[PDB]
Design a protein around this ligand. Structure first.
Ligand SMILES: Nc1ncnc2c1ncn2[C@@H]1O[C@H](COP(=O)(O)O)[C@@H](O)[C@H]1O
Ligand SMILES: Nc1ncnc2c1ncn2[C@@H]1O[C@H](COP(=O)(O)O)[C@@H](O)[C@H]1O
Ligand SMILES: Nc1ncnc2c1ncn2[C@@H]1O[C@H](COP(=O)(O)O)[C@@H](O)[C@H]1O
Ligand SMILES: Nc1ncnc2c1ncn2[C@@H]1O[C@H](COP(=O)(O)O)[C@@H](O)[C@H]1O
Ligand SMILES: O=P(O)(O)OC[C@@H]1O[C@H](COP(=O)(O)O)[C@@H](O)[C@@H]1O
Ligand SMILES: O=P(O)(O)OC[C@@H]1O[C@H](COP(=O)(O)O)[C@@H](O)[C@@H]1O
Ligand SMILES: O=P(O)(O)OC[C@@H]1O[C@H](COP(=O)(O)O)[C@@H](O)[C@@H]1O
Ligand SMILES: O=P(O)(O)OC[C@@H]1O[C@H](COP(=O)(O)O)[C@@H](O)[C@@H]1O
Ligand SMILES: [Mn+2]
Ligand SMILES: [Mn+2]
Ligand SMILES: [Mn+2]
Ligand SMILES: [Mn+2]
Ligand SMILES: [Mn+2]
Ligand SMILES: [Mn+2]
Ligand SMILES: [Mn+2]
Ligand SMILES: [Mn+2]
Lengths: 317, 317, 317, 317
């Protein structure tokens, strides 16, 4: 028998004996992702083209409104907003959601895969809700995941007991569990980084890449892929294995990727799947935020590949 | 005042005083592509998962039957078929069609952007049609193009008069003309190649790559992108500018990409767009095929970038 | 802020402090209706028509499998099955569902509106579940409603606190609450019956109809409508007002419509909306079943119209 | 070996050595109907309901702009417009098109089946186009038909060679030919009329109705059906057989149905299908219009049923 995301979430919330506050939140997210998927695939575009009678601003408004109406949140952090968003008391819930409504928005014009990233924290210090409430290490995540709008739409949800992937059936608007308890390969054979910044890479990265192209033991070099869309690159890593890197350089001394809504959620997903997610010096999830839009270096993927690179880092210390 | 593919193809058939056989063909292509797009986004997967108690193969069948049902074709060449398909004399038309029904199939599991590529030739001769009718240099192409199933489904059609882009509106099942008479940029800022093969590159490629990462005139380096699906990489090249490369290496000293249904259509779109497509030695469209599944090295993109690499190819000539 | 069926159901289940067993059941139904709607609108028909590579049997299999997997039911009664269906212990829940998967199936060939009807009972006598468990008067319904596949798809759900209508947005696969706490007009102006059986009508009906066409006080006669699909006729009644009748005659001495899955659910819906639902002699909901496929005469609609007819019945007694 | 509307219309244009102007027109109609169908099934309603913070009018605009964008029309007559629409000489073609963009609009709130009706005339004359160009008897129709938005969306197209039915596959946005060269039954078993007007009927209608309920030769009575939407009632008549009637009464001694865009197209489809369409006195197609919004009585359906009533009309002549 088939398993939909709606059934799964509910069953899990029943086992966890929750009051159903999180369940509603996860039901709101799902509805939000289906709506973004539809707009991304361009339904109704003929109307812009005069059969007479913006995509990340819309996506932002969809996540915000749908999360608010779930009555399960109190603090919202969007890549698109400068400050955290405090929900009105009338709609307050106990959850804090950090999300990137549409990641890889430069790529929209080229029809490159894009996605939505989200991380959910439980408000802990019960004071008037505020920004500080979102400043929690990723180790404190109740749930995280992402929706990828690629050749098909997929939702990857990670929670304490594992990672699960749901495929969207757009004919009936239901996500079907297609992969249960996902685990990443120990060792991969694809590395993914923008080599256009080779001139600014630290020595460890430099040595790593060279080791991938020209392996000491004459083995096969790793294949290279770099879609340029984090959700897409990270999704291929999780599913196929390998390592993804966006280390610090010059144009980004602390990395380009934001911690709250890009790095933490993917680090969480990777960890539950049996992979590693480091900064080069430290685990991404243990970092204590100081700014909601903070950036952080990130290297994630199969444990052996990440370990190997980490060995090289120590070597240059 | 909206232009749909169906309206466009008809007007063009009228201006060219065609008998309507090529229009019927292009209409059948539009229909096959809409059908493939739908199976790619997974409409109906719930049934596979028992809601009531391959893709590469389905795509081939869709194109083949839809094309045959057009009564405008005599010879069909597919990446999936060892031998060329000769049409039943009952449905035999005068067009030769070369296609790759689903390119990037290995990427399906990762949900990377995939696509369909086709090149149309007019049967030149008067004897029984045969494989030999497809063996024409790409310079003889009547029409060529591709459909990209990415975040949105797009059809790019190139003919003598130029290149046009049609976005699929999945709500009404109609391709809408969104970019007319497209021209690639003279010079881009992105290079695209699988650097996992560095060990295998000839000295000209190696030096070019080096010039892009460490510019000798101290100009900003190029960004790197390599989705891993030709249609996706080329489509980004066409719209954003830059260069795409898949030169020869241990993986066949002859290149990986197939000439008839991958390189030619793309070389044809590029040239019509004001760009270049070369093997490093000769222009792709001028190669006289000798085998329907003949591979060939290819470099395409903005003219200035392609000419720069051609010069390096000279310097090592 | 918008309200989806998924949110609404959950919120209601939280207020009712249910263990979430019914909530899952209602979530399963919703998924089932979206799947039937898609098949009814003919998605994928091109495949039957050879773009190379039953509707009530399918609908039946969809309801059954989806209800079973909800783990919330123990007894299923379908118009399509001779005997009640006893769920395996592994999947048992406390609910009994009586449904007509696709009503108005003759009408399929003519594209006439069709629908799904369902009534839900709570297993009371806790013995090994069986048919007798379904033999409960409709007054014992926990929930009932229907999905109408007309110009648009709608789900009408009735429960103890009222009637609510949800419109299906097929772009995102979500039912949106569009009408809250529905109440029928006191008096209507449309009567609906198959006058083709005039020769077999009892005197009361005969007098009623004649009173509608030739009103004693020279008022405007009632308009007449008779789609021939109960869900469609009953839905226009509920929404617009009036009276619907399928009384006993000769070819059907006890009426044609079945009590468990056609009469009870619509009587329940009508009652919560402030309308009446009689047999001519008695209220439909108070009848105690003796057979699962039992038939029963039915007259329902606005209270004044039904009362008026009931007065006439008493008159001929 | 599947036939899509687009393929069919093209082949027919080719067999008739058309210049392709009528084909462009029929293609624009197919596109408008797909667009209307989508707005009817409510795709996107979630937006109306604030998911991110008329129908009659939208339908008119869709048909009007899509038709004008065809460059095959000079005069457009719509039920919604007081005056005929004269096309800008820049887009002026030679076709006159009469349509009711959304028939049964009052039924929208009840979700009853609704439809689009059109009749196409060839402008016969050489002076400035005007309203007067639409005033041709229906016998002069080049093409006529309708789209029914019911449980599935169907397009019925009638031309000189016959009547064909195309079912819309909303998954790929393509009409598929499912019923070829349709012929109505000689005699049916269903009559369709609004008996709420009994008080107003002329003696011929009254007697006929009486013959159907109480057959003088003791044969089975006719079943009654009256959805209340012409396209729905007529479409059922065409496919299942029988008779449909909307004679004159207090509601205009001239009938309710409009001649140019409701009666003629339907009379034309019926006649091409081997049936009859009469006002009781004359055939509908032979009436010479005098006003674009001229109403006319109509009776159509199986020939034997229509001839029986015509005889009664004689008996009271
Ligand atoms: N849908 C669910 N899936 C997984 N865990 C859940 C679910 N619902 C609740 N829980 C867990 O129970 C806690 C409290 O639930 P709640 O009352 O809904 O806020 C959450 O923070 C989770 O830790
Ligand atoms: N739809 C069309 N678009 C562009 N060119 C066309 C079209 N139809 C025909 N032509 C051209 O006219 C030639 C003959 O058309 P045909 O008679 O249909 O085989 C083609 O090979 C093209 O060169
Ligand atoms: N989704 C809901 N909507 C309305 N009432 C509910 C809901 N869930 C539970 N209830 C009520 O609570 C009872 C027991 O709930 P349950 O434990 O889910 O079986 C049901 O039989 C209803 O009476
Ligand atoms: N697609 C078509 N289907 C059927 N008949 C057509 C078609 N196109 C043209 N014809 C016929 O040929 C005539 C002239 O066509 P046209 O030159 O396109 O205006 C029409 O008025 C019809 O009588
Ligand atoms: O548009 P966003 O939200 O800023 O995302 C762009 C990000 O940019 C990274 C790649 O940027 P580079 O061009 O520097 O490689 C990705 O992996 C992220 O998706
Ligand atoms: O379409 P195909 O026949 O399945 O081939 C996939 C191709 O493979 C190339 C990538 O190959 P590498 O892994 O060798 O870079 C792409 O650029 C093309 O999409
Ligand atoms: O196909 P079903 O499930 O038997 O439904 C037909 C029923 O039949 C009634 C009308 O039948 P008559 O032809 O006797 O009026 C409706 O109101 C019901 O929908
Ligand atoms: O399409 P319109 O202009 O809105 O008219 C609706 C029509 O109205 C007739 C029904 O009228 P009565 O209520 O008078 O039977 C139908 O048969 C037609 O669909
Ligand atoms: Mn963003
Ligand atoms: Mn981002
Ligand atoms: Mn292929
Ligand atoms: Mn290929
Ligand atoms: Mn049934
Ligand atoms: Mn039934
Ligand atoms: Mn109208
Ligand atoms: Mn009308």
């Amino acid at each position: 028998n088939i398993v939909t995301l709606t059934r799964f979430v509910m069953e899990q919330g029943r086992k966890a004996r929750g009051t159903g506050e999180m369940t509603q939140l996860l039901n709101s997210l799902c509805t939000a992702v289906k709506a973004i998927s539809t707009a991304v695939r361009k339904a109704g575009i003929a109307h812009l083209y005069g059969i007479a009678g913006k995509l990340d601003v819309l996506s932002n408004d969809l996540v915000i409104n749908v999360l608010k109406s779930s009555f399960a949140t109190c603090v919202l952090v969007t890549e698109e907003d400068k400050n955290a968003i405090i929900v009105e008391p009338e709609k307050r819930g106990k959850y804090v959601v950090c999300f990137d409504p549409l990641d890889g928005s430069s790529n929209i014009d080229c029809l490159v895969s894009i996605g939505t990233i989200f991380g959910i924290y439980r408000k802990n210090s019960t004071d008037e809700p505020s920004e500080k409430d979102a400043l929690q290490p990723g180790r404190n995540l109740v749930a995280a995941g992402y929706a990828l709008y690629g050749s098909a739409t997929m939702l990857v949800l990670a929670m304490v007991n594992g990672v699960n992937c749901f495929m969207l059936d757009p004919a009936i608007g239901e996500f079907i569990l297609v992969d249960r308890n996902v685990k990443i390969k120990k060792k991969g054979s694809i590395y993914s980084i923008n080599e256009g910044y080779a001139k600014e890479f630290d020595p460890a990265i430099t040595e790593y890449i060279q080791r991938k192209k020209f392996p000491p033991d004459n083995s096969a070099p790793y294949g290279a892929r770099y879609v340029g869309s984090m959700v897409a690159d990270v999704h291929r890593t999780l599913v196929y294995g390998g390592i993804f890197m966006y280390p610090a350089n010059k144009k980004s001394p602390k990395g380009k990727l934001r911690l709250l809504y890009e790095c933490n959620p993917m680090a969480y997903v990777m960890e539950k799947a049996g992979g590693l997610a480091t900064t080069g010096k430290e685990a991404v999830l243990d970092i204590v935020p100081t700014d909601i839009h903070q950036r952080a270096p990130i290297i994630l993927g199969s444990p052996e590949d990440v370990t190997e690179l980490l060995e090289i880092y120590q070597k240059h210390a």
